[PDB]
Amino acid sequence: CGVPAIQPVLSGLSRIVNGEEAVPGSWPWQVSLQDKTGFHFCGGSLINENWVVTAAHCGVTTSDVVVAGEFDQGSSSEKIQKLKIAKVFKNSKYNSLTINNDITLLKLSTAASFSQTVSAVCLPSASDDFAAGTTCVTTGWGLTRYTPDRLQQASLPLLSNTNCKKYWGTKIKDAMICAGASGVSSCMGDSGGPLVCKKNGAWTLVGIVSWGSSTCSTSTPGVYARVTALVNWVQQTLAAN
Amino acid sequence: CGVPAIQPVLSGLSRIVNGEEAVPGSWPWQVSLQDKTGFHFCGGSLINENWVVTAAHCGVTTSDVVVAGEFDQGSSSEKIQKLKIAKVFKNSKYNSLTINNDITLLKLSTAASFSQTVSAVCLPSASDDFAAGTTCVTTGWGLTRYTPDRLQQASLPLLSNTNCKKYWGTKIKDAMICAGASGVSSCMGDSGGPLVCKKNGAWTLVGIVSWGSSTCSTSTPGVYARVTALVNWVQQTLAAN
């Protein structure tokens, strides 16, 4: 997991304004969630050939579908895999008013076929520490909510929850983590999309997109579900099903 | 339906600032949705002894519960009914990015017992016309998201969808309706709460709360699910289940 067959390239422009375009196929766990009509409404991450993780406020159902191996949403020429959803597992502790514990798992009807452009992100262990100030990366097609149709990427630093409350106040709970406010926006992340950090030569999922600045301000950070706080529920669900 | 045993009293102050307090028990279809721990996160409306209607973005599950007959959320002295949910029916056309077709039905495990303070709102027919400029009423405990703990009410006018787009642009779809921007806020409505209008001596459900001004501005209107566009799906669901 976490070692793309096609290595990412991140330059100085990933750190300012709205980030930069990714090298095609270099984020191979990134998937798109689409409704029965093909409309993209959220993102997510592959964790093995049978399972995808996303946000609970996305409200996914078994009539939505997972699209793997995509780079350009406007192209019909690249190889992709459209995968049906057998069952949806929403975390029972999710709360639609506070948006805390914002995670859902999707079990696929038939496995994805892994390749150079389709493979899994690594999950953290519950006790991993990702320190404030660490440079991490968010990817997605989130800018298309307001524009480039190819996958974008931005490098931005994690914040402490105390510093995040200087921006968002009592909205910030223990199962959340924030990143950004460094001269770059967080809006390229789709709801439910990945925030990954590189440790020991492997990329690991640290956050899941929950919400960001309503004006995509370069001085307001994004808010993510904290995966370390939820990975135990993830592994219990996989083992029981 | 739609004829409270205890008549509402609406004064001139229902029309300015943040509205006014309701006469206790005078909105008898109003219910509160709470999680398994008793935390209020949304509103809804009784349509008979076995069924409640609310918003789909509330994300209700069968472990949440319906509370009927409530006036003061801070009191333990008033009679109320706590009702279990047997099954949740989300409208398959709901979309969590656009927030269109924002309606869900809840079927109760055991019927509510109707009384002077607990009874049903009337549903419109699909072809009813509620004209722009009509004064309607929104009720709820929505102000407690930012404060009074008793049920509030405000009188505010419906807008045309074209005039609403001067405020919200391409967010506004055909299955939505807007009200307010007249010197009074819409924020007393809980997510999923009622917008009712009085015709022929009976109160009828015209809207379900979807979203409002992020600053509760007295000059920005609220956005509601248009019940006339969704009542056919409601009646099909009741007949099949």
Author numbering:
A (entry chain A), B (entry chain A): 1 to 146, 151 to 245
What does the paper say about this structure?
ChTg is the precursor (zymogen) of the mammalian digestive enzyme chymotrypsin (CHT), one of several well known serine proteases. Firstly (in the digestive tract), trypsin cleaves the peptide bond between Arg15 and Ile16 to yield π-CHT, which is an active enzyme form. Secondly, π-CHT molecules autolyze one another to cleave the bonds between Leu13 and Ser14 to release Ser14-Arg15, and between Tyr146 and Thr147 and between Asn148 and Ala149 to release Thr147-Asn148. The resulting α-chymotrypsin is formed by three chains tethered by disulfide bridges.
Almost all of the crystals that we successfully assembled into clusters, from which we could average data and solve the structure, were formed at pH 6.5. We collected 511 complete data sets and processed 325 of them using our data-reduction pipeline fast_dp_nsls2. Of these, 175 files had a resolution better than 4 Å. Finally, 146 data sets from the point group represented by space group No. 89 (P422) were merged using Blend cell-based cluster analysis. The protein is a single chain of 245 residues, of which four residues (147–150) were not resolved. We used REFMAC and Coot to refine the structure and reduce the R value to about 18%. We observed that the most mobile area, particularly residues 139–145, is near the missing loop from residues 146–152. Note that the distinctive differences between ChTg (the zymogen) and CHT (the enzyme chymotrypsin) are the cleavages at the N-terminus and the gap between Tyr146 and Ala149. The largest differences were observed for residue 146, with average positional differences greater than 3 Å.
